[PDB]
Amino acid sequence: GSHSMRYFYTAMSRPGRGEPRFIAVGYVDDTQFVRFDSDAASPRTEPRAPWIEQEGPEYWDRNTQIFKTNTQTYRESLRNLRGYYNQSEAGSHIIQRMYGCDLGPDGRLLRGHDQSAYDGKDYIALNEDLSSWTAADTAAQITQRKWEAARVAEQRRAYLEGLCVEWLRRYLENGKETLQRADPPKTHVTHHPVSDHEATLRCWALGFYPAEITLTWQRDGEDQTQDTELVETRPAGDRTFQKWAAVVVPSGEEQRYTCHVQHEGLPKPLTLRWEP
């Protein structure tokens, strides 16, 4: 299977309430394995998946040093970005960063990502060439010119093609029993009359990993996109995810509807009907 690793940074100012909070979490695919929070009583990098606990004390101190220094750097960055937009010192603002590498089914680098956002809009992104930037606006051009001056993309590139891929592979090996195990959805179809002439069919997928999944309703073999109610894929809390799709159908037409399920956990798609 293909795999990826991502770190997610959130730096949040809060004037009148101390210095900005810095939080970092690490993921391998849909599995978090590490966290750091500057707001912690004793801020340090903490395991969040059993397979990362075997990393030695020097691993944890290395992470912790990286994150503490980032905490300070993102506080300067928030200062700067407030200036770039001529904003007042009254408001709270947020920088977000998500970065990482993607591996193909061969363990080979597919590509890297390094994107940042300010108050929830794209701010600056590293292009897929890992060599040039995309600024969303004249404020982010300031950042771009400053990163070009200091050859920042070269640093990002060395990391994304090198250490990122190396540690991802090491994590995938160490947590192979789970990281490289796809658990198929457990499925079923429910039926609930809404009136004398209509009824709800709900298609359920439970206990799957990873989160990525396709759930669709067809009527006489045709896609029922606009007529399907479809909840966001949701975590169960045991590493697995859940989802459902629902359609209101004319009573007596139920067998004309099929639920289709695609997931890495099963060899061929499932086709399901309500079974009374």
């Binding site: 990286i66 960055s77 970005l81 940042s116 250490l163």
Partner: peptide, 13 residues
Amino acid sequence: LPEPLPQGQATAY
């Protein structure tokens, strides 16, 4: 492993 800090100055935004 996150991106390490560089040789010199971690460049702010």
